[PDB]
Amino acid sequence: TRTSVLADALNAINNAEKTGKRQVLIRPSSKVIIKFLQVMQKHGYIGEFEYIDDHRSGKIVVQLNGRLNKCGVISPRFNVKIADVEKWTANLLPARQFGYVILTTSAGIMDHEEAHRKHVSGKILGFVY
C-alpha cells in the first residue's frame, strides 16, 4: 500500500530537487503535506505550490527554488519530549546554525525553532537541510 503520503510526496520532491526540475507533481496531497509545505514556504525552500482539486483526492504542483537540499521525513512519528528535540535536530540537520525539523504538535505543524519559542512539542514529521 501507499502508506505515508507525506513521505511518498517528499520523496518525489527530493528526486525533483536532486535533478534540478523547477517543479514537481505530488499525487495524494494532505493537510499535513500542505502544512509541511507551507512551512517550507515560510522559510523559503519552496516557491509557489498549487493544490489541484481532483473532484476527489488531492494533487499538488510544487515550484522548487533550487534551495531545498533534502526534504526529510522521519518515519514512525516519534513522540518528542521538548528536550529531545535537541537530540533529533542535532542528529538530522547540518549544524546548530541553520535547518528545520518539521514537527506536528498541539500548536499545529511548526518547525523546531518555532516550537521552542512556544514551549510546545509533539510528534515529528520531517525536516529541511
Binding site: 518515519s75 514512525p76 512519528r77 516519534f78
Partner: protein, 145 residues
C-alpha cells in the same frame, strides 16, 4: 527499499524479540549466556589455576617456525582436569622441576592457542610460590628444594 527491519511506532516487540534472537550469533554473547567459561574451559572461568606439574613435556611446534617448546602437563587442582602449560623463558622448566604446584594463567587469547604452541593455552607464573620471571632473571631466588 523498506530496509528489512520493521519501523512501526508500535513495533518494538518485533525488534526486541529479533534482537534477542539474533544476538545469539554473536560469539561474545553466547559464551556469556551459556557459561562455557564455567562448564568448560579448564580454568573455572577464572584468571588462573594452581595445578600440579604432572610432567615436563617438549612440544614440537606448528610450521613456519620449528622448535620444541618446553611445556608442562598440569593437573588443575580444583577441577581435577589436566591441561598443558607453557613455561616461558630460557630453560626455566628447569626452574619448574617435577611434581611442583604451578600457578597458571591464560596465555592471552581468551582460550585458544598463543601462536605456534599447538594445544597449549596457558602460561606458568608461580612455581610452588615464586614467579618464573623472578627466577629466570634471578632478582629473587627459589625457596630451596
Amino acid at each position: 527499499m523498506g530496509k528489512g527491519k520493521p519501523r512501526g511506532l508500535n513495533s518494538a516487540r518485533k525488534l526486541r524479540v529479533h534482537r534477542r534472537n539474533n544476538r545469539w550469533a554473536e560469539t561474545t554473547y553466547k559464551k556469556r549466556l551459556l557459561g562455557t567459561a564455567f562448564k568448560s574451559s579448564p580454568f573455572g572461568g577464572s584468571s588462573h589455576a594452581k595445578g600440579i606439574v604432572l610432567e615436563k613435556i617438549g612440544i614440537e611446534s606448528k610450521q613456519p617456525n620449528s622448535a620444541i617448546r618446553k611445556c608442562v602437563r598440569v593437573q588443575l587442582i580444583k577441577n581435577g582436569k589436566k591441561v598443558t602449560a607453557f613455561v616461558p623463558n630460557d630453560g626455566c622448566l628447569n626452574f619448574v622441576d617435577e611434581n611442583d604446584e604451578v600457578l597458571l594463567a591464560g596465555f592471552g587469547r581468551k582460550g585458544k592457542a598463543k601462536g605456534d604452541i599447538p594445544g597449549v593455552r596457558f602460561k606458568v607464573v608461580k612455581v610452588s610460590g615464586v614467579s618464573l620471571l623472578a627466577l629466570w632473571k634471578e632478582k629473587k631466588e627459589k625457596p630451596r628444594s
